Amino acid sequence: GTAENESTIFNKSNNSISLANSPVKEIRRVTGQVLIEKERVTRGAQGDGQDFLSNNTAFEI
Amino acid sequence: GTAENESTIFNKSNNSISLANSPVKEIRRVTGQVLIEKERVTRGAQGDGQDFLSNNTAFEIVKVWTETSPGVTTKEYKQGEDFRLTDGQTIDWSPQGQEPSGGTSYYVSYKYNKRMEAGKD
Amino acid sequence: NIMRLVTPPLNTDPENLQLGTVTVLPDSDEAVCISFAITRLSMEDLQKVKTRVDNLEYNQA
Amino acid sequence: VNALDDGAMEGQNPLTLRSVFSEGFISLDKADITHPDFGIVFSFEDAEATLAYTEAHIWGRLISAPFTEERTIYQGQASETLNVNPYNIPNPLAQSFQYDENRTISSLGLYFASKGDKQSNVVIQIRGMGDQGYPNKTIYAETVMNADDIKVSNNASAETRVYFDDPMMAEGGKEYAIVIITENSDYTMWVGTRTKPKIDKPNEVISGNPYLQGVLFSSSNASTWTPHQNSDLKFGIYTSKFNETATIEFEPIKLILDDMASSTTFDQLKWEPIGNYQDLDVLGLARQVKLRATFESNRYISPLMSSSDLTFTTFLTELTGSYVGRAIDMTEAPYNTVRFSYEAFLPKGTKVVPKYSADDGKTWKTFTKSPTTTRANNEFTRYVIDEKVKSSGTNTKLQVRLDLSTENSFLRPRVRRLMVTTRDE
Amino acid sequence: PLAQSFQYDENRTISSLGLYFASKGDKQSNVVIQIRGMGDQGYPNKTIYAETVMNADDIKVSNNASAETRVYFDDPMMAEGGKEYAIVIITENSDYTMWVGTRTKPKIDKPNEVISGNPYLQGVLFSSSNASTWTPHQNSDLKFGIYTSKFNETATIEFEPI
Amino acid sequence: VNALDDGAMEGQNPLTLRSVFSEGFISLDKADITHPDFGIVFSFEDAEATLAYTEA
Amino acid sequence: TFTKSPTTTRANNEFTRYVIDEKVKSSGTNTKLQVRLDLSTENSFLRPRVRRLMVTTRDE
């Protein structure tokens, strides 16, 4: 069996989270929202242009 | 090339969202938080048991209540002493508090991640 | 299927008698065996069943 | 059959009869009274279930009444005023009665000395009497009377009439008690007391008991009743007798020349305007046209509808709903055959569709077989279905349902004595 | 004997009762406290769900209805929602009195104030000469208090040092 | 199951269901309270039975 | 005393249903029945509780 999008609200006070199905073979992906502090950027030479971040999955600044 | 977990905040004022890469072949999967209102659930026969929701990707319970007539709330159940969410699949009545009577039916409202369907959603 | 939902295969071939069902736990040596074979009833058993019906209607009265 | 009369079921993990389910319609315990399709009202005195009216501009007149009322019980002597809530005035009442025969109670007569403001209301109920001669918690009828409907007078002359949406069938030899409840502290009623002067004739005094077979009661919580042996309310009970047929005429009223074809198409004995129509016409193009409706009357006609004045919108309403029983766990008794039995009374333009679920109401099935019919009485007919619901394998759950619907408000179906049994064959 | 009816709108676990006595008998006297069910017609029945014996020393008294004697039962009383139950107080001694609140009467500690409404609307004071036939007092109710409990995960006892 | 909810039994020569016995713990009629080993106490509100405290 | 171990089914958070089905007599038939339950505790605070006792007999 495959489970996808299995979900939990994370707590700072309790890091551990459980999986619903007991006999787990392997985990394909764990993912969640992460906050980065103080990343360096250099401004591109074109006027009014685009500067790229270190990750391609950003969604609020 | 493969793009995964391409992220965009959904705004009620503008339903459209753009894809970053131009020459798109196929969309593997679209997934978003959805709210269900007034899902009917039937209370199982084991006391202090678990009742299964219609979707196995739930994560928060908004309201659990009964009505004798449309829009008249007969009782509302208090999360954390009457019931709790378990495994993201079930309302669990193992807490000390009140529960719906065995084999009766009641309403649940909850949030879940829905895999969206092309043409339909 | 998952252990909560798993069920034995459905068969109606008259040329076979079912003896029972074996359930194997997911990735384990352990298995649960149950026998369900359709056993006969002898005339003594049927008379005993008739007496039990007699006692039932007596208790109903 | 024995389970039909048991009438009670535990709230949490109930012991439940395997392969048996029955509903005597004598308690709410069997019913799933919070399912979104649930829409019945109960009549515990008759052990019957039915539909109540719901309100979901030409006016109509009831020329021929479906029944004629008669005042069988009337206690007229009055001497004093008693507050409806004596034990909570800063700084409920009942009155018992009985009949020697089976009578159909259609309406009640009461006399109020004073009332509250416009927004206040009074709840009128009929409750049964226990073996020890006191009111019980069972309620056979209930209605809400606003202040404008409650007439008042300073000489016990004004008689406010109370009507119920379902008639009260009073069995002979059984005591019943009228019950009057209101949260307001500014409601009073006339009461006749022995040895006191009459209000309108002080020269005379109430010599004997006002009503010998009844007793006035008072209570601070509508549970513990204090009797007043020497006092009885001033009240009158009306009993009705239904007739063969009833008639309505709508006051004289889409394109006027054409619309008569549409009108006469829809108005039909087996379409939504069931009432066997007739029509009087002037000159074709006239907006002045007079429609007339007629139906076969019966003993279950609502006294409220009969008393109240109609419209073409309130009339010709589809009342609908369901009975739905609590789901039953048959894990220890799997089944594949079901015997569905019930008695239903079906007036013109009514239906009763039995259903079951093998999955806690996640889907609903319908029987393919037609029921065999046996007549129970003049009204009710017994419908029985015996079908092998599953060709192979066995179900492990059962939930039972009955869907009631109408074509108009006056004619409604009734059901009773529902019994469902399951087998493995 | 006297009794006082009460009810709850939910299932509650009754753990103890609170009563107020104006006077008591001698050392050897005792009072039997019981919880009995309420019949369909709003009167106490013969069924007894709890019973205990309170000695004179356990019965606190006061001249201003300030002393509260606490009654505990060996088994908790599970009160079902929507059902009426009646505390019952029985004693053979004729020197036992209790405070009662009656509508329109002055309060003991505040004579300037009077009990305007019913003291407890959903209950009725009862009296009987044999604990079978009860005469209700609609305008009066006992001064009492009922305690309900919520159980926790674990309990711990500590003993004095050896 | 039906007999579980009866809770009534006659003293002298009671009619009893053949091959059936059930106790609802709602009345003393079914119980042999005079037995030497009888030391259980009923809780009719819960229809349960348990043990009362005894110092010895 | 019964030689078989009971089969267990859960009722609610506290109680558990114990069921025993045993051929008490190999040959012949009994003519009397008297049901008994023996309760015991290790301390005063923790005690057992029993309910819904049902006993039925058969001839097989």
TrEMBL record, chain F:
Where does the source fall among the domains of life? Answer: Viruses
Q: Return the protein name.
A: Uncharacterized protein
Q: What species was this sequence derived from?
A: Staphylococcus phage 812
Give the shown range, full length included.
487 to 542 of 1152
